[PDB]
Amino acid sequence: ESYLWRDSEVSRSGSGDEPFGWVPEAHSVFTERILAEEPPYPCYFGTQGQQRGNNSFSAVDTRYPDTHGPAALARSLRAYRQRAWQGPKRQTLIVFVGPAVPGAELADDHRRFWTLLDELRAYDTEPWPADVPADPSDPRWQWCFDGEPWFIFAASPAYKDRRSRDLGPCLTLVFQVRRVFEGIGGSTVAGKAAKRRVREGLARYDRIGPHPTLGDGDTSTDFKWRQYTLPDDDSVAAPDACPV
Numbered sequence: 418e419s420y421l422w423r424d425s426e427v428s429r430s431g432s433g434d435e436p437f438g439w440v441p442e443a444h445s446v447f448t449e450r451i452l453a454e455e456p457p458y459p460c461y462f463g464t465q466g467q468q469r470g471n472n473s474f475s476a477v478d479t480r481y482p483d484t485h486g487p488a489a490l491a492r493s494l495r496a497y498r499q500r501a502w503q504g505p506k507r508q509t510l511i512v513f514v515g516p517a518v519p520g521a522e523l524a525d526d527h528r529r530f531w532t533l534l535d536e537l538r539a540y541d542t543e544p545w546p547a548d549v550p551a552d553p554s555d556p557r558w559q560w561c562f563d564g565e566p567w568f569i570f571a572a573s574p575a576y577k578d579r580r581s582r583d584l585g586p587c588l589t590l591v592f593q594v595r596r597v598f599e600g601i602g603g604s605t606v607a608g609k610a611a612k613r614r615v616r617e618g619l620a621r622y623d624r625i626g627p628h629p630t631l632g633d634g635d636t637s638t639d640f641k642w643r644q645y646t647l648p649d650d651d652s653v654a655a656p657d658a659c660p661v
């Protein structure tokens with residue numbers, strides 16, 4: 418019924434040539450990435466959330482869009498939002514989009530990601546937040562669903578130098594509600610300490626440095642969309658080029 422899974426429920430996602438028959442493998446690669454010991458995954462928060470049982474999963478199967486597509490993901494997002502606002506603050510939803518496409522370029526995976534986020538809006542039950550501009554060209558735009566803005570980023574196997582955003586063979590969407598950042602807002606002492614620690618991790622793991630669009634946390638950053646789909650290099654997209 419529900420396509421929202423905890424780690425122990427993933428194996429029932431699918432088998433074989435079924436819808437989601439590739440999902441257990443995608444899940445297994447993801448957990449190996451973020452639990453690796455040497456070098457450790459740069460985001461220790463994410464590692465800790467996995468070890469502690471606080472990550473949830475879902476998927477989109479491009480071969481079954483009527484049943485295992487954007488409409489179903491929108492249901493899973495609503496169920497996740499409810500779980501994310503209870504119990505531990507540091508929860509993440511990880512969504513695999515598959516099956517994997519051997520040979521896909523990063524730009525192909527980014528286009529897929531934006532099309533998904535665009536499409537999901539049609540299946541929201543709630544009014545768009547009246548304090549968040551709905552127009553993606555606005556500097557204060559953020560992707561919103563079920564009444565609130567989310568934190569969201571795209572992971573792909575086509576990230577070569579920014580290996581931290583290679584989470585396995587599928588386009589992967591990593592969703593969180595703002596609750597995750599309680600106590601470690603970018604302007605707090607703890608929040609700065611967390612940036613230093615993750616950034617040291619990145620230097621160890623990736624071949625390219627942290628991207629310029631990740632700010633210092635002292636103000637709300639304009640054109641947050643850019644952080645959703647970082648390039649594999651140091652280039653900065655035109656602020657008006659959000660594909661939604």
Ligand code: HEM
Pocket residue numbers: 451460462463464466472507508509511570581582591597598601611612613615616631632647
């Ligand atoms: C499975 C879950 C997670 C993954 C895969 C993950 C992944 C990442 C990655 C790849 C970055 C580097 C910046 C970027 O590419 O956008 C990052 C940075 C960060 N993450 Fe995580 N994360 C996870 C969960 C969390 C959670 C649950 C929190 C908070 C509780 C958190 C806090 C942060 C912080 C503070 C940074 C540093 C941002 C900066 O230096 O500006 N992450 N995360």
Ligand SMILES: NC(=[NH2+])NCCC[C@H](N)C(=O)O
Pocket residue numbers: 568570638641644
């Ligand atoms: N797990 C992550 N990559 N988090 C990115 C945080 C984005 C940032 N706090 C902002 O809204 O400007």
